[PDB]
């Protein structure tokens, strides 16, 4: 008899306060923990 | 046997026991962080 249990839960809540570009950094957190350099520069310009 | 009378008795018994336990595992952990500041908005890259 063999039994295996797998359980992994990872949740992120980015806060990017760039009015329209604020949602980009929040949506990019899905599977991408590191922030995009180009997206970060765009948010800084915003 | 003495002489008619004959007697013979044979006995045999063996035992064996073995135990083998092996456990090997490794755990590693490493954390790295950074902090910086920059004193236009283009330089934020």
UniProtKB/Swiss-Prot annotation, chain A:
Mod. after translation: C-, N- and O-glycosylated. O-glycosylated with core 1 or possibly core 8 glycans.
Transmembrane regions: none
Subcellular localization, as worded in the UniProt entry: Secreted; Target cell membrane
Summary of subunit composition and partner proteins: Monomer or dimer; as a C5b-7 complex it can also form multimeric rosettes. Component of the membrane attack complex (MAC), composed of complement C5b, C6, C7, C8A, C8B, C8G and multiple copies of the pore-forming subunit C9.
Recorded disease: Complement component 7 deficiency: A rare defect of the complement classical pathway associated with susceptibility to severe recurrent infections, predominantly by Neisseria gonorrhoeae or Neisseria meningitidis.
Family classification: Belongs to the complement C6/C7/C8/C9 family.
Task performed by this protein: Component of the membrane attack complex (MAC), a multiprotein complex activated by the complement cascade, which inserts into a target cell membrane and forms a pore, leading to target cell membrane rupture and cell lysis. The MAC is initiated by proteolytic cleavage of C5 into complement C5b in response to the classical, alternative, lectin and GZMK complement pathways. The complement pathways consist in a cascade of proteins that leads to phagocytosis and breakdown of pathogens and signaling that strengthens the adaptive immune system. C7 serves as a membrane anchor.
Name of this protein: Complement component C7
Native source species: Homo sapiens
UniProtKB/Swiss-Prot annotation, chain B:
Location of this chain's protein in the cell: Secreted; Target cell membrane
Posttranslational modification: All cysteine residues are assumed to be cross-linked to one another. Individual modules containing an even number of conserved cysteine residues are supposed to have disulfide linkages only within the same module.
Lineage top rank: taxon: Eukaryota
Transmembrane intervals: 1-9
Function comment: Component of the membrane attack complex (MAC), a multiprotein complex activated by the complement cascade, which inserts into a target cell membrane and forms a pore, leading to target cell membrane rupture and cell lysis. The MAC is initiated by proteolytic cleavage of C5 into complement C5b in response to the classical, alternative, lectin and GZMK complement pathways. The complement pathways consist in a cascade of proteins that leads to phagocytosis and breakdown of pathogens and signaling that strengthens the adaptive immune system.
Disorder: Complement component 6 deficiency: A rare defect of the complement classical pathway associated with susceptibility to severe recurrent infections, predominantly by Neisseria gonorrhoeae or Neisseria meningitidis.
Entry's family note: Belongs to the complement C6/C7/C8/C9 family.
Assembly and interaction partners: Component of the membrane attack complex (MAC), composed of complement C5b, C6, C7, C8A, C8B, C8G and multiple copies of the pore-forming subunit C9.
Protein name per the record: Complement component C6
Source organism (scientific name): Homo sapiens (Human)
Lineage summary: Eukaryota, Metazoa, Chordata, Craniata, Vertebrata
